[PDB]
Design a protein around this ligand. Structure first.
Ligand SMILES: [Zn+2]
Ligand SMILES: [Zn+2]
Lengths: 77, 176, 112, 49, 134, 97, 91
RNA sequence: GUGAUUUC
RNA sequence: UCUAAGGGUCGGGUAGUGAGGGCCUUGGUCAGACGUAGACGGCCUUGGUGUCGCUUGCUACAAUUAACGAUCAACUU
RNA sequence: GCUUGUGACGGCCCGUGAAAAUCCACAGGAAGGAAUAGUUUUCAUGCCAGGUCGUACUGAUAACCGCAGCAGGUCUCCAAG
RNA sequence: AUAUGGAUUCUUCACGGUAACGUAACUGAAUGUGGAGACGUCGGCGCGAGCCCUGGGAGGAGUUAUCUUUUCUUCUUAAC
């Protein structure tokens, strides 16, 4: 299990040839004792490693979900 | 490893070979400490280790010279004919090629009495007090075996005797 | 108050059968066998632990890259750089003594 | 006041004398320790180095 | 007073420890960037391989390759020798401003490389082009 | 005596105590004479001699170890090598000792 | 000051082994557990590792010597006589 | 062969 | 039931000039996709929580009373 | 605080307290290797594969030994207020 | 077994740092050498882990003749 930060690296990795499945996980958390906010984890299943990208912005997460490849099979929660 | 001089060869017969002391180590069952001396093999490009009996004053990193024409300094080994009158040696070869037989225990040495004209002979006073004549080509290390004064301390304890004599071959406790 | 057991079949407190106690995601205590601690590699001359070299069990060095096992200098993974400095100085002065001594020997055998 | 400060000054000078005496005592003790080592053969010559 | 331009020293610390350099510019006072008595020097990273009579033309050409380097060095990290080497062929290229640019370092190293190769082919300073065995 | 001329130099002229300072002086070309303890390691002895030859500086080997050289110079610590930068009063530079 | 009037380092032996034996052990014990000067670096950093082996804490030099003291008088005289007669060989 | 050590 | 004793962490200033970091109360320009709403956000303040202040450069008793105060905790005599 | 691991030290020895497999590094440099083209699998990623035998249960006043289903013996780990 | 990316190379086999040394890499046969494997016992001192003790809060259970913002219990986090 590895955490990936760059969105460009995440997209190239999700286009990698060995990658077939990804997962979108929704968490409800608090920001600095603030309001309950949304966290989206994108977990791309590679041959060796599961790569996790953590996005704390719901709109950016939605737009990335749109940006995902079609052939990749996504499991929601 | 047994505590023996270097094997006799042309270098030690005529010139000198220089080795270096790497460690001074404790041998089980032996009072005297041992010195590991590394030499360069004259024929093959490889380092050869030797296990000498450390004399008093020998230290790690010291240069030890072995041969007929080596300096008369403590630690250096020399043929008995190359040393002057009255010198003191240790690990004295009885005869050429035996690699050391006399004065090997701690605090023991051999004094030189005088040389001989007719052939290469020298006479020596052994630690007991005997006067013996050996071939003048027999080698010896300059100085006195290290670890002297060991027998001066009482053991005081059967347990100390037990630990001393379990490493040796002497049967302890003694019967009959 | 939860008590644990060894997890391998060695039942003895040997040097290679040391355990730690760890709490798991199931909320229970459990034994976790710990491997032997690695030893820092030592300098070939002085015996001091040379720095910049990873500390691993001997077989594990076959897995890491070269950079983990060496420093960028002569004798990088073997000597400790003070020994290297002394080696360099000794070699240079040995060469210088050879030059001076050879000149002296030639002049002496000229004037002898 | 004047006699009390005289006593303070005499005490301070006596304190200095006592310190000098204790320094002398330490010097003599070091001397005796060195001689004891000499007798006991606990001194190493430098000719080896 | 003997650490001057043209002097040959032996680097005793750093990645180039054990190499022979020639001092191109000594700053005994130091500088703001290096607050210590130092020296801009040029040296050989990879010595030319020792060739013999048997070796062919291509073999000799490929065995007479030299990799130079340029560096600012603390005086305490030099073992100065008694030998001299003509630094005039690159006194202009090897300067304080050169080390502030990786490309200028590259061009200065080109200059020093060709100069040292010419000297080695001419046959000068075989000790300076000889490698120390330690 | 050698100790007496060293004492005169220590009380009158300029000196540096220690290997790093004496090497700095030799490099800068300030030293005249270097007194080296008989106990100094041989590698350091040879290096100091090479520096002094390059700097045209006289070398004298003191008879005694670091403790003896320190107490002769007049300090309470062990001293291995002393460099004489000025000997304006004492005549240690010219004497055979 | 002095916790023990006479017995000294031999206080670990209590009342055992006899007064004369304790006295004989005392001097050699004091020699053995002492800290000696180093001839090579000039520091009081030398301690025994084993009978006859003496190591300096600083400068890390190991030397061969006596069983309970760094040097023996016999070794000192042998060293001096070697020096003298090798000098006369030179002369 | 005697069995710590000291003293008488 | 009391009395006494035995500790830790943080605390230096305004008299004084002027800039720097962050949701900048209110007020000002550029300016963000989705399901009447529209945050966050890429830019600035002499203000604010003689012009308080969280920051360095510094003159001015820097403390020879920090010889004291705020805060935290254990069980021993 | 208890159990345990570990670090830097100190003490003790006329006692100074295994070996080998195995893995790594250094020195050296036989050589090989590029221009409308090479190298580097001690960087990352991707592909394939991992045989044989043990594995249940007790481990003792009911599972072993004393002719027993004997008030006996038999190595060791965890250890709450 | 092998390919792609990266790195490297027209100064062929990397640059940076005064230095200790750094990094994603950064060729290597004979031969020589070094390290790890690899090591006694005791004492106190420091640190970590599990356990022990304990405060707030969010739940569940017990007691309530009288009293107790109460007694018990859950609030966890593996290799890598
Ligand atoms: Zn070293
Ligand atoms: Zn020493």
């Amino acid at each position: 299990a590895r955490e990936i930060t760059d969105i460009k690296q995440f997209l190239e990795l999700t286009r990698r040839a060995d990658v077939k499945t990804a997962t979108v996980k929704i968490n409800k958390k608090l920001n600095k004792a603030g309001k309950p906010f949304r966290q989206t984890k994108f977990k791309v299943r590679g041959s060796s490693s599961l790569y996790t990208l953590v996005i704390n912005d719901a709109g950016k997460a939605k737009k990335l979900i749109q940006s995902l490849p079609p052939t990749l099979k996504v499991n929601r929660l | 490893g047994a505590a023996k001089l270097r094997t006799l060869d042309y270098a030690e017969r005529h010139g000198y070979i220089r080795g270096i002391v790497k460690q001074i180590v404790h041998d089980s069952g032996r009072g005297a400490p041992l010195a590991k001396v590394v030499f360069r093999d004259p024929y093959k490009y490889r380092l050869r280790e030797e296990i000498f009996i450390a004399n008093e004053g020998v230290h790690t990193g010291q240069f030890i010279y072995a041969g007929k024409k080596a300096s008369l300094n403590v630690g250096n080994v020399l043929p008995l004919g190359s040393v002057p009158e009255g010198t003191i040696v240790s690990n004295v070869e009885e005869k050429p090629g035996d690699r050391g037989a006399l004065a090997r225990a701690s605090g023991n040495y051999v004094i030189i009495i005088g040389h001989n004209p007719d052939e290469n002979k020298t006479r020596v006073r052994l630690p007991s007090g005997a006067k013996k004549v050996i071939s003048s080509d027999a080698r010896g290390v300059i100085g006195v075996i290290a670890g002297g004064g060991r027998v001066d301390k009482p053991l005081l304890k059967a347990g100390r005797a037990f630990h001393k004599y379990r490493l040796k071959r002497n049967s302890w406790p003694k019967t009959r | 108050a939860q008590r644990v057991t060894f997890r391998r079949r060695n039942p003895y407190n040997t040097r290679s059968n040391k355990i730690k106690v760890v709490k798991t995601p199931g909320g229970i205590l459990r034994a976790q066998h710990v491997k032997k601690l690695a030893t820092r590699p030592k300098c070939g001359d002085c015996g001091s632990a040379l720095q910049g070299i990873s500390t691993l069990r001997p077989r594990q060095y076959a897995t890491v890259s070269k950079t983990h096992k060496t420093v960028s200098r002569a004798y990088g993974g073997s000597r400790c750089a003070n020994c290297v400095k002394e080696r360099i100085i000794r070699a240079f002065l040995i060469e210088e003594q050879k030059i001076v001594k050879k000149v002296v020997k030639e002049q002496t055998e000229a004037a002898k | 006041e004047e006699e009390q400060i005289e006593k303070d000054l005499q005490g301070l000078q006596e304190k200095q004398r006592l310190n000098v005496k204790r320094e002398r005592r330490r010097k003599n003790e070091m001397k005796q320790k060195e001689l004891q080592r000499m007798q006991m053969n606990m001194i190493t010559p430098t000719d080896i180095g | 007073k003997f650490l001057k331009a043209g002097k040959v020293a032996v680097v005793v610390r750093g990645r180039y420890a054990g190499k022979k350099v020639v001092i191109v510019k000594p700053h005994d006072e130091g500088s703001k960037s290096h607050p210590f008595g130092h020296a801009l020097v040029a040296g050989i990273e990879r010595y030319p391989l020792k060739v013999t009579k048997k070796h062919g033309a291509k073999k000799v050409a490929k065995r007479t390759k030299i990799k130079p380097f340029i560096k600012v060095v603390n005086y305490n990290h030099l073992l100065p020798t008694r030998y001299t080497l003509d630094v005039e062929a690159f006194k202009s290229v090897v300067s304080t401003e050169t080390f502030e640019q990786p490309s200028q370092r590259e061009e200065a190293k080109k200059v020093v490389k060709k100069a040292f190769e010419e000297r080695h082919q001419a046959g000068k300073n075989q000790w300076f082009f000889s490698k120390l065995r330690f | 005596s050698i100790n007496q001329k060293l004492a005169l130099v220590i009380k009158s002229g300029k000196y540096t105590l220690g290997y790093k300072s004496t090497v700095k002086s030799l490099r800068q070309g300030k030293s005249k004479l270097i007194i080296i303890a008989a106990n100094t390691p041989v590698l350091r002895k040879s290096e100091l001699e090479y520096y002094a030859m390059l700097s045209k500086t006289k070398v004298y080997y003191f008879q005694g170890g670091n403790n003896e050289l320190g107490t002769a110079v007049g300090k309470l610590f062990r001293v291995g090598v002393v460099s004489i930068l000025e000997a304006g009063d004492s005549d240690i530079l010219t004497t055979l000792a | 000051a002095k916790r023990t009037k006479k017995v000294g380092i031999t206080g670990k032996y209590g009342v055992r082994y006899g007064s004369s034996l304790r006295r004989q052990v005392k001097k050699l014990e004091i020699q053995q557990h002492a800290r000696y000067d180093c001839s090579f670096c000039g520091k009081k950093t030398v301690k025994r590792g084993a009978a006859g082996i003496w190591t300096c804490s600083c400068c890390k030099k190991t030397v061969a010597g006596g069983a309970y003291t760094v040097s023996t008088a016999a070794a000192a005289t042998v060293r001096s006589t070697i020096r003298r007669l090798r000098e006369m060989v030179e002369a």
